[model samples]
Target chain A: MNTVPFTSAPIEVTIGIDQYSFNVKENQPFHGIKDIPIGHVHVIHFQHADNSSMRYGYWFDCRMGNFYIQYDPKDGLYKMMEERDGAKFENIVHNFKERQMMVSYPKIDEDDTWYNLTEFVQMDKIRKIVRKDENQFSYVDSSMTTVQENELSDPAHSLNYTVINFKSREAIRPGHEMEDFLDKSYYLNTVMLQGIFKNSSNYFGELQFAFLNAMFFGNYGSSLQWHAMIELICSSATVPKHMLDKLDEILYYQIKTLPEQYSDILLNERVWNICLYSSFQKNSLHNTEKIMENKYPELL
Target chain B: GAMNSSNYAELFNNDIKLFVDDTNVYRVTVHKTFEGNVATKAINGCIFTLNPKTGHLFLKIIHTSVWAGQKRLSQLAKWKTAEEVSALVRSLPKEEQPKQIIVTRKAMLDPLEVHMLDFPNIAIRPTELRLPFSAAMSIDKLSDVVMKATEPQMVLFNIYDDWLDRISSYTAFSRLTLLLRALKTNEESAKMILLSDPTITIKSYHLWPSFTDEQWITIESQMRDLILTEYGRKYNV
Candidate 1:
């Protein structure tokens, strides 16, 4: 009897690749299902729309490593998307989707919870409303299936992957209650930061997210002074020496009247400070110092 | 009368300490005995009595994992406090000085490891685990078990977060030693092997399944080895 209302009749979709971007409006039939005893996954497809070039079929071909996207309509894209043999496309979303992972989509509103979609999908299945449509799913009828498997093998394979359907009816609303995937996801700070930086368009959100990236990963090649300055501004801790010289040019000492409230920048910095203490390692910190040097040359 | 960070009182008074020496290398020592009438978990703190100049660093905790090299892996490699300190220290600069760094565990960090009632030879003693099964608990319990197992002993080092691990190892192993002696597992073999052939690779937030029961046996053997080794040189009453 209860169903989630489509917030805005299927939010506008724009799938993009390295050079080209596609405004895909045709909500193609999502096929395939991977069950995560605790999660779920759904592979949504868009039939050869004009934007198929941006799809896995055009971009992630074998000639290039699947680290990026693929555009071959056959096993190349499918296997790559599903992470199988000879797959050449980079479908990072495939696993997240297949695991029915709850992720905040681009342009998610303030009221929407971080991982609402994932919980919603779970609820739909719990309610026994999930439909099984095998015809729309992909079959292992492609040539590259074998090759895709070999490429997918890694010692660090994680089987606890989840894929969530964003369009499920039982999708819960933020503040209303459901899954806490967003919070759980925070344990993997890098991934969560990647999603926040790339997806959100808010000014403070973007700046804060970027600041966190610079602070933790700090351009590795910068001066300690620049590092310290950035850390001071970005976090509560005193930044290192190599980072200090790097940030001198872009930043000046000026104390503007506080906006009177703790901004997202402040909240994020505090949160990151906690993470830094929890997961900082000398080697990784060293690598981050090097990375920070690359990201903020203007500051240096 | 030497005070150390582990014993130094923040709210009260204790005498443990961790600090960077003249070489800028971090060091910790538990030199002072329990003085006050109010007794703490005294045994769990690093025993600073062994002269830092003479006593080896025992290096129970590796920078990352327990069975750091290919030789032995301690059972509590992932769940011990020393492992937590190791994880914290690994994030710092080699020059960052241990005392200058501090890591506040967001959750109940100390209770993570099950205190073994025997096996002093096994610095981070091997112990059985009954992981709490639940949602939030499942995460913390498993992590505590794994992390506690790999904690390093900073008994002779001066480091900020290292103190946390020192206490944890003491708690687990002191209990282990008492238990082993009670079980007479302490006497059968003169050279008991307290540590397993090191297979524990300490990685930040890395999780893997158990290695082998033989690894478990190695932990007991190492403990026996430590006891026998001690018995060889010293007279045990």
Candidate 2:
């Protein structure tokens, strides 16, 4: 319904946690050049673990030397506060002006809420929710005694594991799935292929695989992912995350949000077969200047 | 490859039970089954136990109501108490006291790994050899590995004691008595050039800690060379 510039108060921008901060190059004036990162209006096109086709996620915009990822309006304001450690400035999405764009830090109040009320409107004084909320949000469920009480009841996952094949077309549980599609070497990949054909729009696989194919060096399918990785790698402040196994391990942890019961396709341990370390090994011990002098082929 | 609880509990079912005692090597008694005793120390929410003597390692999960939903390490019975050992001592005659009894490791809660010892299968006679060492390896049923016009193999064994925070040996002496017996039974048996091994080694892995491209290549070349050198010396070719 609207479009606005996608940035707020300058804050750190990074691909994943504990990774290279995607900051502006020091003292470098903004220049529009091919293959060089001067501004940040980045977006990720990734496959949801339950869908084969790309569901775009993590829209990033860099302004005044920092990155701010646009928030999905569907997750609601409460979900944002819970996940982002109460950093309350919420930039939300998918509205278009001439083309699709974001509404950054739109005005809203505790009682006002976001039903797009007639009286409600955006104004300049309504700008930022910059500072982090000082206290952690506690819940009816997150207490130690409440968790202790949970041990007496059976986990809900047991009933979820009943389906043997790709019987239900629902989104697959993170660590549990249909028995046939669950870790049988030949069976899993084959069933996944069938799922790809039968219902690719809803059919899914690992999100990290999309990340691997995108941001990681070898499979630079998506332009922005590769650009982000390459730009960050070529940046001055050395990120250990830029090393061989760093990105793999970062997404590796991201993938590790659930335990591996050998179910979900995203949890494949074999996904780590690549040669990022080989690059680090070669560049470090040898003349580091050789990397500097060589053309695109060298550093890559 | 995927480990679950049913198979893990079976480690105690038909397997040998080992007793790790305190402070000193008193002696050992190898029993066939870990019958009634329950393991008090459950690791995580599952069961995982290894017997280097039998060369077996497994992870299994089981559900029990006592631990509410899941109970781990259902067979933590591989240890004996001072009073329990005394009862066994009383059962045995006084004359048999000197026969054998020694347990290993100071912390009963510590983990372990194999330390392979070199056993020269060629140029060294059975009388002139020192052998045995370890892993979660399955070369146990591998007597038929070397067939006609067959190639020999290399084996190294030892253990890493995480309890002592040191590289150490197995307290139980049953490392490869049967494996050696199986090999010796075959006259055309492979001359496995068993070599050295180490970790927690002082100079261990210092060369390629954060290996450079050349260092990985360097390590690979040396490993290939090391094998080749042994191949040359093993057959004197």
Candidate 3:
């Protein structure tokens, strides 16, 4: 992997979509200890009905400073697009210096065939755990028409939802003005929330539960399947994916996957019970922040 | 809990022969066999019609059987036949275009909570009031009786006119009715609520334009308070 000094790029890094508000905070530097944001990112949300578990996906597009989510109706296997609007960069998971890490913006060919830029980003440094390609890659059958709509009738959840929080940095120029980059989407938090969910109790589990339930606020659990939810959770982590090397492999593995008929153990598992027994006992929402301190000292 | 096609077709057929028309109030007489010394009161000719279609009947008549308290109320019509209800309706006078008709039956559907409406919990108000509602039925079982009862009833109230409102009401009642059915099955205080001749009350809500926030809040609170103070306090959570 190539090591280069972190610096600002010439291109305008802030890109905003109609749904999301964009900003750059001065205290939150891109790669350092300052609050100043060097660039911005966009966060867009979408939901899937039919899955009982994880139901939403979040995406981040650095070059466009925008991200999009894809919701799945079964088993919550909803995924974010690996490539966006034909952008030049591609991300791949690779073993760099003996550690598993993600490489982004790989080189491309005439047919726009992508080549690994694995040397640029270090996946090993950032990711915690990522599922390997060999294990069954789960997904909902895109071809299946929704048999039941479930009325989106959860007691509280009533609308299709998306949440985007904007962060900004201001500079007083010839005219009083400010510049910002769309910061990270809470999608990351959602991913972390699910991981914590699969693993916790007390405050963290409840907090994660609250955030997830609030994410869809007023709807019933029938909107999406459990597999689709898993996809929603898996995509959020900084887990490394080798797009170039695994493009055909990933395509063969994930495309046209069959939908579940309430038979799979993953989809049938009750999330509330899972939270009660998983990591929730020691990590209640009240004590979650403290727990994070020990595990992610640098982040703290 | 689950509705298949034959059930739908039967409900459709029975509806043609006999059922209550909610919109067109008619005072029609219905006869039923009363065994063992209980005087059979000729429903004194009331006005009513069974729904004509499969989907409607499933939602209304057959759908109420999927929860607690509702099992005993659902009878599945073993001894009673569609011919019996039809033969009774024919005996009413042809003139005076009766203003109302009411038939209360022991439920025939089995127990176990099913259907989308069974979640949360069932209430006790409908049982306490002893409103003259019918029993839970299957498309085939119910349709068999309805098809032979009388001519098809005309439609005036439909899903579109007050779709959401009606569905919500039915949903609320679905659970409430189940609770009543359960009470009856278990031989609780409300055992006779379905067939009793005590006080009954009916309330209508704004439909076309829907109820405004103020109207809804006011009506909902007052009625709920009344129910809580009266029946709910004694039997419900």
Q: What lDDT does each candidate get? A: 0.26, 0.25, 0.26
Q: How do the residues A1-300 of candidate 2 rate in per-residue lDDT, one tens digit apiece?
A: 112223221222211111111232222221111121223222322222333332222222223222223333464111112223222322332222223332133233453211111111111111111112231211111011211234323332111111222222232232222221222322222333244323221111112222332232122222222222322232212323334233333332333322233223322222221122332232332222232233122233
Off by over 4 Å in 3: A1-300, B1-49, B52-131, B135-237
Point out the higher-scoring one by DockQ: 1 or 3. Answer: 3
- State every prediction's TM-score relative to the real structure: 0.19, 0.21, 0.19
Backbone clash total for model 2 is: 26
TM-score of 1: 0.19
True-vs-predicted CA distance for residue B109, candidate 1, Å: 12
Off by over 4 Å in 2: A1-7, A10-186, A193-209, A212-300, B1-237
Better of 1 and 3 by TM-score: 3
RMSD of each: 24.6, 24.0, 23.0
Name the runs in model 1 displaced over 4 angstroms: A1-14, A17-21, A25-71, A75-300, B1-237
Task: Report residue B140 deviation for candidate 2 (angstroms).
Answer: 20
lDDT of candidate 1 over A1-300, digit per residue (tens): 101111121223443221123343433222222221122222222223442332221111122221222234343232223234333212433543554532222332453221221222222221121122222222111111121233333312111111121112222222211121112222112222234223212212222222222222221211122233233233313333433332321222100111223222222343333333332222224333343334322222
Residue-level lDDT of model 1, residues B138-161, one tens digit each, is 222222432354344442322111
